[PDB]
Amino acid sequence: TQDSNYVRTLRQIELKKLEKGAKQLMFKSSGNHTIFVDSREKMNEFTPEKFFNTTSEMVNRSENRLTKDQLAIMPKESLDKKKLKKFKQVKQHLQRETQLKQVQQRMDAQRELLKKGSKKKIVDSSGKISFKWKKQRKR
Amino acid sequence: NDIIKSGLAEKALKALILQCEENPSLKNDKDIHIIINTGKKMGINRDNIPRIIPLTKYKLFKPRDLNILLITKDPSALYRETLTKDEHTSELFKEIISVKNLRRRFKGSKLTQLYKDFDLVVADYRVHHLLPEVLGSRFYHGSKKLPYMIRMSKEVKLKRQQMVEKCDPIYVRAQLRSICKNTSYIPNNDNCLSVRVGYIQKHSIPEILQNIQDTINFLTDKSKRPQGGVIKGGIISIFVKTSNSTSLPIYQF
Amino acid sequence: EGTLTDHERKYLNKLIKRNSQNLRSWDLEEEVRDELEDIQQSILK
Amino acid sequence: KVVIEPHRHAGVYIARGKEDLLVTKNMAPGESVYGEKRISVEEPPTKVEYRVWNPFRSKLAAGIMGGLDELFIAPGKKVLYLGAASGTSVSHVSDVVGPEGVVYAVEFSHRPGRELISMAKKRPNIIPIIEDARHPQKYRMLIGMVDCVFADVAQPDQARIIALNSHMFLKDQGGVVISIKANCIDSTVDAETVFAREVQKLREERIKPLEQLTLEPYERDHCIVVGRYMRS
Amino acid sequence: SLAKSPASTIQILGAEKALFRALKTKHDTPKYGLLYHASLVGQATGKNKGK
RNA sequence: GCGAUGAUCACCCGGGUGGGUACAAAUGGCAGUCUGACAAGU
RNA sequence: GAGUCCCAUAACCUUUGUACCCCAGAGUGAGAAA
RNA sequence: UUGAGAGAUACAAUUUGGGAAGAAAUUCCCAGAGUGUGUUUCUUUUGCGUUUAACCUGAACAGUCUCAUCGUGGGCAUCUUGCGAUUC
């Protein structure tokens, strides 16, 4: 029982760290952005830069697309690597949480065997071992 | 490819070959080695594990030419049976022996006779670390007959699972062709290194030169690591010699 | 009022390059953009 | 220091730097309505507090990340928020509109409402109209014109709700922004087909669609449709 | 927020330090928390206080 | 127009950073809210 | 079944705001100014 | 080797719009399409044969007694050398 308590307390800590981290992170949108035009000719002559009034490089930035009007001391690479490091740290938290979830699950499966009841082990062709209890109501 | 162009390599090889006929003491010398002076210490502890250098242009030997011994895991019944019956590998080996049988049957002077009889020694990669004690000192100094690791079957291992024991005759034949046709080297923690490049009376001087550039190219190319690209920092000099002849320079920096 | 000279239309179009160029440093590099997508999909999933 | 910078839609800012987050200037400095992290930076210098806008919590914020061409919510405008569950998104809408603008937040469920009322005390520009949206005639007094109508109601008959609200309170050439959940309307068919029907329904209600935007990865099977209300 | 908490937490609401120290070090956990000052618990004695 | 009633003894560009001492606040961090079906009598 | 009893009504760290500091400490002990 | 449709990707030819540099032609950068071929994913049409298939469920482990857990001894280093998991 104390083992299950200990393993869980670590897992809950890991989850809480992750959700705090993900709030820091920003996630690029990947979704279709359909435009509606009343005329067929407007559809054919449509161009993203003209509709958004932005330079062509600037069109592709979804989060902050700025009209040409608005457009009118740390090294960049080290900044870029540091952004990458933060993403990796949150990802590492997820892996730790998932690993802890599996460990906590199997320990509970062991605890059920300890408790009173009548059980039979069933082994699948793949070799996985599980226990099916008899349909006896608990007094 | 500069070393081939330089006439110094050609002129040295002609002198080396010419001497071998004239001098009685070099009559039994048949192989040509190149001695490489790497600029800095390699840093690789000698593990007695050969590393193969692919010689693309030409082929040093063929499996049929050499007396080949195979040392297999105990029991050797499976490996011996499959190799002997299959047409491709039926005649590929001088003899097939297990490690325990090799230890029991051959001791003392019998090891020396075993060294003379066989020109090439190959072994299952699993038993290789045992061989130094069994074969004795004579095999494991000088590098003439160091056992070569070979993998019997293409099956790979996974942690917490058991290897399935199989024997693939074509794969065993396939690896052995690569060993004999290509040259090989063994790392050591110093400047010096020795690699075989040709055989007297079998390879012409231009053929030997081509092998030398292939050896140098593979050893210097960092893209070929860990097997190649081990000579970092350039080569101060290169020599050519037989087993007992003196080192004749062929390239200096 | 849309009275731009070509020189007027040029000096501004230099500013467009100037400011857009500045935001490229923040926008981050494409090679890291490639790997950072792989990380995200794992954590989002 | 973090370099807070402008964004296309006025009242929205991006705290560019080591962490890049959408932020909005805080109407009520010194507190977070739902525990969001707060960033303050000095400008000529006086410090001004900004609140983080989390896209996974507000569908509108997911709209910004997708890069909506046009937002009818802007500083100095009146906004009608339908389906205001709490201050998770209404507070951010209250920020962009600014002290001049006002936000009409409409909600039905009692329990989230008491949360909304408590938040409305901190924000003077939020008029909380906890009422059922299906009957706009009830709360007509407390609402004047509205420049834009934002709807997050997750109902099958939402299109009717927007038509009824739009006809009464929305300005001519006024704004309507809708957040759509495919699963609530029709789980049998794919999300795209459901979105097609909703666009057609709005057209019959004298609303021209301008933009459609799926909100992935922030939400699955969700999209925002933006249109302009032409009464003529 | 208290209503949305299960019975176990309400038992040990006021003894997080002892509880959350105990969990991490694999030792026994407290059993009274803030409720120890309740009148009914005072009437009990021995191990019955925990029950 | 002196004194034992006590002489003497960090940084950068007028401006900005660095470090130290006392108090106050934080819906800032450490930080994660125990187990779960038997027990008592004749 | 199970540590209230090492004040989670708390301690520590970080950020902000305010008010002061950038000299020695059992401080030194006859100079200062011209 | 049936028909049709939608999508992705590789290649070849060819084209749309924004920007800079050039007197223009022209040069470069960015964003993008449709055409032919090859590959691939899915949707369905038609011809032929076939009427069942999968899973669950009743008092369905256990005399050669079965199983769990904590310990002990030995084997596999020519390797299941063994994860709070199940090596024999």
Please tell me which of the candidates D18, D66, D218 has its beta carbon nearest to residue A79: D18
Token pair 């299109």 in the structure block, residue: D159
Contacts with A6 from chain E: Cβ below 8 Å: 23-24, 26
* Nucleotide minimizing C1' to CA distance for residue A14: F32
| Best CA proximity match to B43, nearest among B230, B179, B194 | B230
Please identify residues in chain A, positions 75-114, with a C-beta within 7 angstroms of any atom of strand H. 102-103, 106-107, 110, 113-114
Cα B45 to Cα B188: distance, rounded to the nearest angstrom = 6
Tokens of A121: 């082990």
Among residues 5-34 of chain A, which lie with CB inside 8 Å of chain C? 22, 27-28
**D220 CB within 8 Å of a chain C CB:** no
The two tokens of residue B1 are 């490819």
The helix-helix angle for D59-66 and D87-97 (nearest 10°) equals: 60
Q: Verify if strand H has an atom below 7 Å from the CB of B130.
A: yes
The answer to whether residue A70 neighbours chain E at the CB level (below 8 Å) is no
As beta bridge partners, residue B251 has B238
- For the four alpha carbons of B176, B178, B182 and B188, in that order, the dihedral sign comes to negative
Confirm if D113 and D107 have CB atoms less than 8 A apart. yes
A30 CB within 8 Å of a chain E CB? no
Helix (H/G/I), strand (E/B), else coil: A100: helix
Measured distance CA(B219)–CA(B229) in Å, rounded: 5
Closest C-alpha among D114, D71, D98 to residue D227: D71
Number of H helices and E strands in chain C, helices first, is 2, 0
| Contacts of residue B169, Cβ cutoff 8 Å, sequence gap at least 6 | B82, B83, B86, B88, B89
Could you tell me the two tokens for C21?
């160029």
Secondary structure of B46-69 in the HEC alphabet? CCCCCEEECCCCCCCCCCCCCCEE
Q: Is E26 on the interface with A (CB under 8 A)?
A: yes
CA distance B225 to A58: 43
Q: Which of A22, A33, A65 sits opposite D8 (nearest CB)?
A: A65
For C8 and H20, how far is CA from C1' in angstroms?
15
User: Distance of alpha carbon A86 from its chain centroid, rounded?
Assistant: 14
Q: How big is the CA angle at D19 (ends D15 and D23), to the nearest 5 degrees?
A: 30
Measured between CA atoms, the residue of chain A closest to residue E25 is A6
Spatial CB neighbours of D59, under 8 Å, sequence gap ≥ 6: D89, D152, D179, D215, D218, D219, D222, D224
| CA dist., res. A56 & res. A52, Å (int) | 10
> Shortest Cα distance from E48 to chain A (angstroms)?
22
**Number of Cβ within a 10 Å radius of residue D220:** 12
Q: Which of D135, D147, D131, D162 is nearest to D224 (CA)?
A: D162
Touch between chain A and chain B: 3 or more Cβ pairs under 8 Å = no
Q: With H, G, I as helix, E, B as strand and everything else as coil, classify residue D77.
A: coil
Covered bases, chain F (protein CB within 7 Å): 27-38
Go through B153-192 and write b for each residue having 16 or more CB atoms within 10 A of its CB, e for each that does not. beeeeeeeeeeeeebbbebbeebbeebbbbbbbbbbeebe
Query: CA of A40, closest CA in chain D: separation in Å?
Result: 15
Does C43 reach chain D within 8 Å, measured CB to CB?
no
- Helix, strand, coil % (nearest 5) of chain B? 35, 20, 45
Strand F reaches within 7 A of the A96 CB: no
Rounded distance, CA D121 to CA A109, Å?
Answer: 51
* Spatial CA neighbour of A120 closest among A136, A139, A106: A136
Contact C26 D16 (CB under 8 A): yes
Nucleotide in closest CA–C1' contact with E20: F32
For residues A67 and A70, what is the distance between their CA atoms, to the nearest angstrom? 6
Breaks in chain D after (C-N > 2.5 angstroms): 44
Partner A, chain E 29-48, Cβ-Cβ below 8 Å: 29
E14 touches strand G (CB under 7 A): yes
Q: Residue B237, exposed/middle/buried by CB under 10 A (0-12, 13-18, 19+)? A: middle
Angle ∠(D102,D70,D181) on CA atoms, nearest 5: 85
Cβ–Cβ below 8 Å for A63 and D21: no
- A74 Cα to chain C: minimum distance (Å): 10
Closest CA to A33 of B71, D173, D66: D66
- Cβ separation of D20 and C26 shorter than 8 Å? yes
Separation between Cα atoms, residue E31 and residue E51, nearest integer Å: 9
Contact A29 D18 (CB under 8 A): no
Q: Is D144 an interface residue toward C (CB < 8 Å)? A: no
**B219 contacts: CB under 8 Å, gap ≥ 6:** B36, B53, B185, B193, B195, B228, B229, B230, B231
Other beta carbons less than 10 A from residue D12's beta carbon:
23
Burial of C5: CB neighbours in 10 Å, binned 0-12, 13-18, 19+: exposed
Calpha distance A107→D113 (Å, rounded):
43
A21 touches strand H (CB under 7 A): no
Residues of C in contact with D3 (CB under 8 A): 26
C26 interface with D at CB cutoff 8 Å:
yes
Q: Mapped to the 3 state alphabet, what secondary structure does B53-122 carry?
A: ECCCCCCCCCCCCCCEEEEECCCCHHHHHHHHHCCCCCCCCCEEEEHHHHHHHCCCHHHHHHHHHCCEEE
The alpha-carbon gap from E23 to the nearest alpha carbon of chain A, in Å, equals 5
Neighbour-count burial of B236, counting CB atoms closer than 10 A to its CB (0-12 exposed, 13-18 middle, 19+ buried): middle
Cα distances (Å, whole numbers) of residue B132 to B135, B150, D113: 6, 16, 83
Looking at the complex, report in whole angstroms how far the Cα of residue D162 sits from the nearest Cα belonging to chain A.
Answer: 20
Is E29 within 8 Å of A3 when comparing Cβ atoms?
Answer: no
Q: Chain A residue with minimal CA distance to E28?
A: A2
26-45 of chain E touching strand G, CB 7 A cut-off: 27-34, 36
Distance from CA of D71 to the nearest CA of C (A): 23
Cα–Cα nearest to E23, from E14, E11, E15, E32: E15
d(CA D3, CA B208): 67
Q: Which residues contact B13 (CB under 8 A, 6 or more apart)?
A: B32, B205, B208, B209, B240, B250
Of D14, D62, D213, the CB nearest to A33: D213
Residue A139 CB in 7 A reach of strand F: yes
Q: What is the dihedral of CA A58, A60, A63, A69, to 10 degrees?
A: 20
- Asked if strand H comes closer than 7 Å to B224 Cβ, the answer is no
Contact A27 C40 (CB under 8 A): yes
Domain ranges of chain B: 7-61+183-252, 62-182
> CA D95 → C1' G5, Å?
50
Three-state secondary structure call for residue C34: helix
Any alpha helices (H) in chain D, and if so which ranges?
Answer: 59-66, 87-97, 110-122, 158-169, 182-185, 191-204
Size of interface A-E (CB pairs under 8 A): 13
Q: Chain C within 8 Å of D20 (Cβ-Cβ)?
A: yes
Distance CA B172, CA B150 (A): 7
Contacts of B among chains (3+ CB pairs under 8 A): none
Bridge partners (DSSP) listed for residue D105: D81, D128
Please give the span between the terminal C-alpha atoms of chain D, in angstroms, as a whole number: 51
Give me the residues paired with residue B229 across strands. none
Residue A103, H or E segment: helix A76-114
Structure tokens at D108: 């039905």
Beta carbons within 8 Å of E28's beta carbon, 6+ residues apart = A2, E22
Taking the CB of residue B220, how many other CB atoms lie within 10 A of it?
A: 18
Nucleotide nearest to E14 (CA to C1'): G8
Nucleotides on strand G with an atom closer than 7 A to protein CB? 1-10, 16-17
Residues of C within 8 A of D16 (CB-CB) are: 26
Give me the amino acid identity at D27.
Answer: M
- Asked if the Cβ–Cβ distance from C19 to A81 is below 8 Å, we say no
Structure tokens at A23: 């709030």
Chain C residues inside the 8 Å CB shell of D6:
none
Contact D119, D94 (CB under 8 A): no
As a three-state string, the secondary structure of D93-151 is HHHHHCCCCEEEEEECCHHHHHHHHHHHHHCCCEEEEECCCCCCCCCCCCCCCEEEEEE
